[PDB]
Amino acid sequence: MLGEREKLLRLEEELHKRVVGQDEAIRAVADAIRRARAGLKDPNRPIGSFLFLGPTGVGKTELAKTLAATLFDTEEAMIRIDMTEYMEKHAVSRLIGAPPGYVGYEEGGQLTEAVRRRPYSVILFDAIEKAHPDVFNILLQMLDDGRLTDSHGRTVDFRNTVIIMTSNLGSPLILEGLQKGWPYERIRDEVFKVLQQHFRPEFLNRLDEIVVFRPLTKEQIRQIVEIQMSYLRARLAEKRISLELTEAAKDFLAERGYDPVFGARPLRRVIQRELETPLAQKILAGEVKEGDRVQVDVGPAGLVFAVPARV
């Protein structure tokens, strides 16, 4: 391997393309993967296993998707599992395959059937704490064996997955860590204390890395707005239309589009509502014709749209 190497030394850059900010989190991930490809990790255990602590809407899933895409060359190459739907006893059977003579037997269990059909992939468990403690045991086994045994007794190979578990447990106490005093590492410490209270220490050690996601800064969110309206620019390029934003215009979209409790979840449909909707209005009315560079500024009733007349 030579080109596969080149991609790994430049790995962080490849991820920052799609994931703004969260640099600490990205070293963390990228490192663990270098230790894999170098061959310093136990080869009968998955490429990497992570705990993603932190607020919602600030990059967890994105990184998950991005990683998947930059490692296995597609967003499809990742499996999302929601621990909210696994709070029951009945859960275990849906995860790996309900015992014979059961509704969802031969149709398999979606986890084991996904990994079975796609052995090199990223796997995302959301709200790992919401999981029924039975389901944990199944995960732990997998974390040590790189193997799981489904209902039909067929053994499923996880030695080529990256495992990522998100949880919001820390969050209300990384808010105190946001307030400077607790910088790079001290948060990753004071959180461990709360983690021990919810998670057994056998579990917190199969884990390759515990990663703290921080909230976003205005300038960061501003960047996300750009990446966020990439498809639209491309869409508009087909009719040769440009979209200069203003400093304030970006800030407006950022203002409306970042809920603290939800991060940038709302953003995409804010952009859609505040910028795409009125832009369609203009385009259809003819105030924007094929060719124009449209300028976009803030006002009292939201975004306002300027076109230079013809030279």
Residue 245 DSSP label: E
Contact flag: residue 19 with ligand ADP (CB under 6 A): yes
Closest CA to 188 of 73, 278, 21, 54: 54
Least distance between ligand ADP and beta carbon 17 (Å)? 9
Distance CA 31, CA 257 (A): 32
The answer to whether residues 119 and 161 touch, using CB atoms and an 8 Å cutoff, is yes
What is the dihedral sign for C-alpha 20, 21, 23, 25?
negative
Least distance between ligand ADP and beta carbon 105 (Å)? 32
Least distance between ligand ADP and beta carbon 243 (Å)? 19
Contact window for ligand ADP (CB under 6 A) among 13-21, 110-118, 131-139, 300-308: 13-21
CA gyration radius for the chain? 23
Residues 36-75 that bind ligand ADP (CB under 6 A): 56-62
Residue reference for tokens 């990384």: 174
String of DSSP letters for 126-140: ESGGGS-HHHHHHHH
**Residues flagged as binding site for ATP:** 54-61
- Give whichever of 97 and 263 is closer to ligand ADP, judged by the CB atom: 263
Which one among 127, 174, 224, 270 touches ligand ADP, defined by CB under 6 A?
A: 224
The answer to whether residues 111 and 161 touch, using CB atoms and an 8 Å cutoff, is no
**Count of chain residues binding ligand ADP (CB under 6 A):** 17
Contact flag: residue 264 with ligand ADP (CB under 6 A): yes
Distance CA 67, CA 120 (A): 12
Which one among 11, 15, 20, 138 touches ligand ADP, defined by CB under 6 A?
A: 20
Contact flag: residue 79 with ligand ADP (CB under 6 A): no
Contact flag: residue 250 with ligand ADP (CB under 6 A): no
Least distance between ligand ADP and beta carbon 262 (Å)? 8
Length of the chain: 311
Q: Site residues (CB under 6 A) for ligand ADP?
A: 18-22, 56-62, 224, 263-265, 268
